[PDB]
């Protein structure tokens, strides 16, 4: 019936004075736009069909054409920012928000989806969706005693669209919109479906990606323990956003970092720092670096959980970017730690993998490492054991690499190197 029409036939049907002919043509458009290989989005836009679809969204008397037009417009809005803009410019936003009230759940769902694509374009369309009043009717759809009574596809779409209203920066979402949405995110974060949980963690990870005030809004809602629990999930689509959220939170104040520690996050990091997915290992090492930048009692909890040998491990062998995060974790540790903690770090074997990384072609990591070596030499000075440390660096081949760096290109490198040789290797 409606399989593989031409754009010309769709146009002729939508321009007929016959609601049923329009409905068949609109469904044909939906099927064209639903095919996976090169949907003719631009031809549909050039044919002037968007204003027609938008008007069909408002035909309460004909719910099937509401659905078909909602689906067609959803897939146009899923394209480039220029294609999403065409949908917005046709007035789709208020029309989709009206459809959130629809008594047909498959139509309400499609309006949820479309608004997610529009909001997902970026900050401007996200805030415009919010200004048109989308948040109240979206949250109303979740005002049930038990989320389990909703179809899980429906619930996944809602969670995903909410996550897009939490997404993006410059600017971040309006504070009052974030406060409005957070209680529902907290509830969704306790729902058993893996996809809902993942999308909820993504939303939280967006909201914690910013200044300390934004982090605080989230931490104050009490979700850190649930995030730590989700950090231990077996589904990697859950672990990835949960870990990103935890990592964002520990970029905050030392008190916010402490709530991640108190919730038990450090117990999960033996697995995360050896995780076979390179992105998880990198994000976990980054997170560790922002914990070793904290107080001495927080460094001490990293020590107590046995995580220093795991940092030595990733420094010794991992993807290069992970190793660079490990280098940072060590430079922060040595910068803020006590003498005892630095002594312990050396006893765990940090020196050799640290030197081995001076061979790398990345001048920033060379700076980070040289800074770490100075910090350790300073702790040795305080113990009068500068010489044991010089001997240890020399035996593993580190001296060779440091003089090689006397004649390095970057100026910060060669001045830090010379200083080290002048002072400790005379």
């Amino acid at each position: 019936g409606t399989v593989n029409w031409s754009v010309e036939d769709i146009v002729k049907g939508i321009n007929s004075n016959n609601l049923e002919s329009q409905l068949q043509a609109t469904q044909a458009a939906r099927k064209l736009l639903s095919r996976e290989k090169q949907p003719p989005i631009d031809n549909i836009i050039r044919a002037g069909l968007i204003p027609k679809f938008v008007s069909f969204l408002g035909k309460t008397d004909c719910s099937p054409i509401q659905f078909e037009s909602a689906w067609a417009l959803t897939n146009i809005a899923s394209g480039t920012s220029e294609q999403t803009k065409a949908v917005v410019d046709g007035g789709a936003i208020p029309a989709f928000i009206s459809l959130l009230a629809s008594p047909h759940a498959h139509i309400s769902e499609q309006a949820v989806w479309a608004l997610g694509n529009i909001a997902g374009d970026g900050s401007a369309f996200r805030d415009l969706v919010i200004k048109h009043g989308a948040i109240d009717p979206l949250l109303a759809l979740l005002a049930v005693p038990d989320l389990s009574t909703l179809a899980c596809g429906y619930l996944r779409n809602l969670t995903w669209t909410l996550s897009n209203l939490c997404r993006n920066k410059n600017p971040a979402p309006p504070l009052d919109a974030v406060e409005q949405i957070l209680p529902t995110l907290v509830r969704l974060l306790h729902h058993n479906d893996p996809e809902v949980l993942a999308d909820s963690c993504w939303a939280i990870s967006y909201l914690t990606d910013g200044p300390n005030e934004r982090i605080e809004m989230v931490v104050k809602k009490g979700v850190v323990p649930q995030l730590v629990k989700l950090l231990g999930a077996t589904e990697l689509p859950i672990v990835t956003p949960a870990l990103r959220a935890i990592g964002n939170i520990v970029t905050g104040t030392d008190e916010q970092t402490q709530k991640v520690i108190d919730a038990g996050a450090l117990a999960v990091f033996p697995s995360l720092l050896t995780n076979p997915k390179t992105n998880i290992q990198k994000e976990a090492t980054w997170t560790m670096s922002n914990i070793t930048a904290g107080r001495q009692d927080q460094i001490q909890q990293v020590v107590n959980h046995g995580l220093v040998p795991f940092l030595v491990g990733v420094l010794s062998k991992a993807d290069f970017k992970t190793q660079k995060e490990a280098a940072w974790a060590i430079t922060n540790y040595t910068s803020g730690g006590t003498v005892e903690q630095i002594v312990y770090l050396v006893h765990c074997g940090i020196i050799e993998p640290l030197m081995n990384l001076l061979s790398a072609k990345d001048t920033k990591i060379i700076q980070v490492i040289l800074d770490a070596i100075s910090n350790i030499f300073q702790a040795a000075e305080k113990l009068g054991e500068t010489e044991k440390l010089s001997i240890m660096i020399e035996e593993c081949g580190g001296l060779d690499k440091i003089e090689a760096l006397q004649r390095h290109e970057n100026e910060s490198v060669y001045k830090a190197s010379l200083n080290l040789i002048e002072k400790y290797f005379s």
């Binding site: 639903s34 899923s78 995903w160 996809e195 956003p241």
Partner: peptide, 10 residues
């Protein structure tokens, strides 16, 4: 869904 910012309905 997950971290996709846009997605069509196939």
């Amino acid at each position: 869904t997950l971290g996709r910012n846009k997605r069509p309905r196939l």
